[PDB]
Each structure stands twice: as C-alpha cells, then as structure tokens.
Design a protein around this ligand. Structure first.
Ligand SMILES: *[C@@H]1O[C@H](CO)[C@@H](O[C@H]2O[C@H](CO)[C@@H](O[C@H]3O[C@H](CO)[C@@H](O)[C@H](O)[C@@H]3O)[C@H](O)[C@H]2NC(C)=O)[C@H](O)[C@H]1NC(C)=O
Length: 361
C-alpha cells in the first residue's frame, strides 16, 4: 500500500514546538511525501517561500536514509486562486508553457513527480482539467526517453458529489494519473450554522439528508464513475475542525455562532492541529458518533470534531477492504511530529496508526 503524506511550507513559521522543518520526517514513515505548495508565475512553475530551494533539499535528503522514498511537489492549494489555474488551463499557449517547464524544475530540485491541487475546478473547466492532465502526462512519458525514471503525476480531487459532477472527468483522468487522492475530509463544509463532523466515515442514522457527505459515499461514487480501486487514495485528516457553540446544547446538530478559537500554535480560526487537540482534551468531555464512527469533544463553549488513533485505524481498515491503493494524510506537520504533546510516546501517532494497519494484511 502507498502512504502519501503532505508536508506544508508555512509550518516552519509556527512559533515554538509547533514549528516544523522537513527535518522532522521519519524517512521510513510514509512512502511518498508531497511538499506543499509551489506557485505558478509567468505561466511557469516556481518557488513560493524565500527558502523553498533550501527545504526542498532538506526534504529530498530523506531519500539518503531511505532509497525507496519518493517525493513530489504540489501546484495550487488554497491560497492559489482556482481562477488563476483556470486561465492557465483553458488557454493552449500558456498550458504548453506551464507543462513544458515542469520536468526541468522537478529534476533540478530532485522531486519524483508533480501533484496537482487545483482547488475545485468548476463546470466550465472539466474539458481543460482533462486537457492539462492528459498533456502533462504525455510530456512526462516523452521526457523519460532521456533515460531517467519517469516522473509521477497525481491530483488532489474533491469528494463532494456536486464537486465531482461539476468539475472532473474521473473516467478520463484516472487513465492518465499515477494516483488520485480523494479529499475525504472537507464534508460539513464552509457554511452550516449547525455542528457536524468534517470527516465522517459512514452515513449515520441521525442523518437522513446529507448522505453524499462521508468517505464511504465519496469512495463508492468514484469507483462507480470509472476510477480503478488501485489508483484511489483516501484522505485521512490529522487535524480537527472546531466550533464556538451558541447554547448549552452540545449534542448532535446543536446551533453555532462561528468557528472555534485559534490554537496556541496553529493560529487560525476553525482549525486545530492534532497536537493541540491532545492538549484540548484534558478537561474536555469526549463523545463519539458510533454511526459515523468518529469522535468529537467539548469544553466550555468549544466543540471540536477530530480524528484519533482509533478512528484512523478504522478508516484504514475500510480502505483495505474496499481495496484502494492506500491512504493520504493531510499534514505530517499537523500530527504530533515531535511526539511530546499526546500522552503516549510515539512520534507521529496518527500517521503511525494508518501505517500499522496498512502494514498488517
Ligand atoms: C505567485 O505568483 C504570482 C505571479 O503569478 C505573484 O503575484 C504577484 O506577482 C508579481 C510579483 O511582484 C506582481 O507583479 C509586480 O511586478 C511588476 C513589475 O513590472 C509591477 O509593475 C507590479 O505593480 C507588481 O508589483 C503582481 O502584483 C502579482 N501578480 C498576481 C496577481 O499574481 C505572487 O507573488 C507569487 N506568490 C508568492 C507568494 O510568491
């Protein structure tokens, strides 16, 4: 099985223990590490932070302790407007320009492929996402003739039925990609003034109408649209989403006033890193949707929907039973990478759990 793990750039700036450089990665933990967020500029791939050429190297040296590790660079992400991507992809001059510039760049910094995080292609982009994948791959094949190993190509696809139906030709792009990472973590989305879980595994009996919004549906759906099981990779979040409540009603579907308060280290309304969740937990009440089999917590007026070792093992078993290619984990830097926040003594507890289950049969 593959264990694809994202490392994010802006996580070096976190103050204190929360700060994380490629340096922290167990070279033997994942199978592919994807460095997170390259820019595009002048229709040409390019660095994003000032020290990216340094960290790249830092990351790609893990391949010195483990010859089998492959690393990849991701274009796009959330601070890269999709409408930018759109201009690049719909416009055959600037598409070739972008594509053409990707191998020399990857090769120079020692990556093994490119991962495309086009965050949400729209209805009038499908034809072109298809054009960009198809053409990007074709170029990767042509560039292997130079006798080097073929670069890998992947994409981070959504998992909302509407999103899938609007922007992606799943059948056509699975034929060209080395693996699809299903983002099975952004469910209870941007909006709802009700509490809910962002990464439910299952449907849930207390949920008659939403049902397109859990990992099990997204997966069964992609399988039905044309993606082969051995290209699907299922996103497991290593962070938690929080809410500031608006009443003592703490239970299933209670009302909300807005996103939870920021983490002491992660500093960002709505998100909590798993390491902060470990600290939040002391003096909080835990509960667990058994239906969807994922936990939430509460303390004062904060309700936190998160993943712990047990649920992550669970999702990991799910994936093997459906025979997917493996798991994808959002943010090695969001997990307890130091190993000193969450009681027990493991380094990277969540990612370890997925690894352990993936390693077992
Ligand atoms: C990712 O890539 C973007 C470019 O595609 C960057 O953005 C900005 O890029 C440039 C760089 O400053 C800005 O253009 C300046 O240059 C000319 C000089 O001739 C000036 O005349 C002009 O006033 C600008 O200051 C753009 O303003 C801006 N372009 C846009 C809308 O993308 C971006 O910097 C980069 N991201 C990071 C963080 O590296």
């Amino acid at each position: 099985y593959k264990l694809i793990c994202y490392y994010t750039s802006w996580s070096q700036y976190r103050e204190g223990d929360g700060s994380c450089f490629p340096d922290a990665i167990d070279p033997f933990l994942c199978t592919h590490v994807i460095y997170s967020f390259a820019n595009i500029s002048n229709n040409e791939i390019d660095t994003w932070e000032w020290n990216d050429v340094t960290l790249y190297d830092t990351l790609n040296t893990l391949k010195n302790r483990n010859p089998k590790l492959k690393t990849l660079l991701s274009v796009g992400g959330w601070n890269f407007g999709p409408e930018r991507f759109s201009k690049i992809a719909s416009k055959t001059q600037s598409r070739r320009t972008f594509i053409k510039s990707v191998p020399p760049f990857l090769r120079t910094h020692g990556f093994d492929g490119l991962d495309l995080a086009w965050l949400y292609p729209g209805r009038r982009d499908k034809r072109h996402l298809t054009a960009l994948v198809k053409e990007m791959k074709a170029e990767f094949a042509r560039e292997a003739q130079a006798g080097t190993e073929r670069l890998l190509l992947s994409a981070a696809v959504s998992a909302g039925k509407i999103a899938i139906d609007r922007g992606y030709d799943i059948a056509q792009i699975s034929r060209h990609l080395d693996f699809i990472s299903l983002l099975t973590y952004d469910f209870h989305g941007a909006w709802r003034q009700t509490v809910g879980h962002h990464s439910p595994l299952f449907r849930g009996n207390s949920d008659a109408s939403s049902r397109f919004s859990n990992a099990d549906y997204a997966v069964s759906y992609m399988l039905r649209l044309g993606a082969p099981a051995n290209k699907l990779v299922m996103g497991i979040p290593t962070f938690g989403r929080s809410f500031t409540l608006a009443s003592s009603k703490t239970d299933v579907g209670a009302p909300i006033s807005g996103p939870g308060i920021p983490g002491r280290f992660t500093k960002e309304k709505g998100i909590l890193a798993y390491y902060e969740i470990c600290d939040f937990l002391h003096g909080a009440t835990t509960h667990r949707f058994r239906d969807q089999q994922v936990p939430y917590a509460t303390k004062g007026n904060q309700w936190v929907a998160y993943d712990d070792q047990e649920s992550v093992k669970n999702k990991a078993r799910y994936l093997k039973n459906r025979q997917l290619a493996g798991a994808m984990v959002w943010a090695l830097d969001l997990d307890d990478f130091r190993g000193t926040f969450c009681g027990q003594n493991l380094t990277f507890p969540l990612t370890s759990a997925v690894k352990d289950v993936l390693a077992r049969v």
